[PDB]
Amino acid sequence: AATFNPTQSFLGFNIFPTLTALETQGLTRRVYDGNVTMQSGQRSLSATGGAQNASSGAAASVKSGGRLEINIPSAAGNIVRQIDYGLNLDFFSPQVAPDGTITLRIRGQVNQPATAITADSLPNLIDFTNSEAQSTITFKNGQTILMSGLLGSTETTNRSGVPFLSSLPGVGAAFGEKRTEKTQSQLLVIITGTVVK
Amino acid sequence: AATFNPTQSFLGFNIFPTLTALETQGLTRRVYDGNVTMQSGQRSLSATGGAQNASSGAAASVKSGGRLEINIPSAAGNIVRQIDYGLNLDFFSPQVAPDGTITLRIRGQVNQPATAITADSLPNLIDFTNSEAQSTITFKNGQTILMSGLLGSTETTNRSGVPFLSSLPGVGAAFGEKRTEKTQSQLLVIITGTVVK
Amino acid sequence: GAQNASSGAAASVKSGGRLEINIPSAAGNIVRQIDYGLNLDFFSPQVAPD
Amino acid sequence: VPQLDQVVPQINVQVRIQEVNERALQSLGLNWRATFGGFNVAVSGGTGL
Amino acid sequence: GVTVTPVLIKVSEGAAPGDTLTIQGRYLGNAQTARVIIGADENGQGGTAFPASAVQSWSDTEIVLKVPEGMPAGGSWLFVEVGGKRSTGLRVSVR
Amino acid sequence: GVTVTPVLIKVSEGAAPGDTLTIQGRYLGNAQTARVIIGADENGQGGTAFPASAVQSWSDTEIVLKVPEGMPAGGSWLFVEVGGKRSTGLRVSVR
Amino acid sequence: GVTVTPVLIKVSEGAAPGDTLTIQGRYLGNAQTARVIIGADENGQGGTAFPASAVQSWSDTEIVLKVPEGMPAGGSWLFVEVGGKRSTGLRVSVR
Fold first, then answer.
1. Would you give the end-to-end CA distance of chain C in angstroms?
2. How far is residue F71's CA from residue F20's CA, in Å, rounded to a whole number?
3. Closest residue on chain C to A137 (Cα)
4. Which locations, inside or outside the cell, does it occupy (chain C)?
């Protein structure tokens, strides 16, 4: 942004520069290891206290985290729900063969509320950071199998400034800005099991 | 963030530093040990006082904590519920063999309201820190078995500052910030039982 | 009790967030889940002896 | 029964979703105003002469 | 060398001097790498280790022992330490 | 030359010295380009590599090994490093 | 002369030295105008081109190759460059 003034004239040369530079890193880990003991032809349990839960039909379960209780009266049937966050592990239909081969349906889920529940919240819309998987696997007694995996990556790499000068290698940042970001992620769900004599 | 001023000039060198350092630890334990005496073909009890409870179908129970009573009128059927917190232990279908082999369904649950109930609270959404498990186990008279276990871990490890200088080992913290957090957790549910002659 | 677009999938994997929606209505309540981030759904995975 | 109770294959399927976007902008403009005897000329980009 | 926490899933009953004590778990290692500790508290502190001569079998998922003479009778906690790493405990009743 | 991360999908049980250990994956490469590391932690650090003489077969989707003498018993992590690039790990139990 | 981006739709499995690698696409050109590059990264950088003697057939919708000796084993990206223009890539597993 250059201008010319034909009526005045500055004295000498002034440069008035200003520099800015920033660097950052982060690293988040979160690990869960859950055991459940169960039987071959195990059925689900129907207690539910009248509320609806996504793990009602599971033969076995383990949870750790929180739980939202929702009681909304309606003329088409009341909305009475339970939403669980934290860690949820559900096991469905765990048949075992005389060899020791285990067949099983596993869900597994890690989630958190995106923003805290503050007693002024309404149950009409909730945001819930979430990661989930579900499938059926078969393995023999003592083996280890990966049910699901997910690898991610991003990059943004912006740049701005003077035409043809901000794009020069190295000295380009003397004529504008520059910014770059990179992200990585990994999610692994691993299953093993043994027969308990 | 560096600047230059071609019109003035400071006298000498000044450094104006500022240091900050913090360390922290925490450790929470919480333990429950519950007994219940019961029979082999024991059935549930249906009292309920008209309210719905998640332990109505349990052959035996033990509770300690609190209990929310909810009375919401509705045109599709009133919502009349009870939500128990603290410790809840439910036993379902406790058959015992002449050997002394005990088969049993156990739920077990520890939970607390996330924020205190204050008589201005509404029953439409409640937050309830929670941990739970349920499964069927079989063991002989006098043995001990783990029904469920859960091991956790986190880490955050942020870092920020001057490019390439804040990342140097040791002296990196002289050019910016640094932060690290770590968490561990363990949850164990263990069952034993004896025949009472 | 909620409606999700991946209910009929044989296998799934998700990572991102999830919107929970509870709207009472006289024609039937709107109880939905909307997932964002990454959604991968697999339907009907037959494998031949080859 | 021997045919309905056989082992069926177990598989692992991998899906990759890839997305790349690029941008490029280029602006350039002169905006002056001249005053000589009697005349007053202004040239801009929004309005012309 | 040992990074994974061992898990104790089941112990048998009794445990009188001369009886057979069976332990079942997941990452239990070797009899040349690990040891069983009995009489400990909830945190694994205290307690006395079984002698190596008390071991009848030791797989990675099952340990069979013979209870020696001189163990502390009453209730206590049992742990398995594999390569210096402590397992999850179980309560045992020494007769 | 190797840009894609190898994926480990299944390992077998046991792994006592003299037993056969089978690994199944996707981009596992060659026995002349890659190596198997056992005894590592969650991040792949530490651990000891299998000798090249322990390899019975090595396809891009299956590795078959013979467990040598001297591996650390107990639980640990197994990785495959193809062309210097580390795979996703699996937990293995050395007997 | 070449304005349209080639599209790679399918590659076969295996790719061990001496095996046959088949590629199917849309605007794949001529063997005298284009070349196949293997071992590249997600962006097409790096990688080594197949020799012209490795080509068995080359239509505008199918390329058939013989894998030479010396390719980098493991996972990598495969591209076809037609008249200097790069295609969309596919991941290939060199044995």
1. 41
2. 14
3. C11
4. Cell envelope
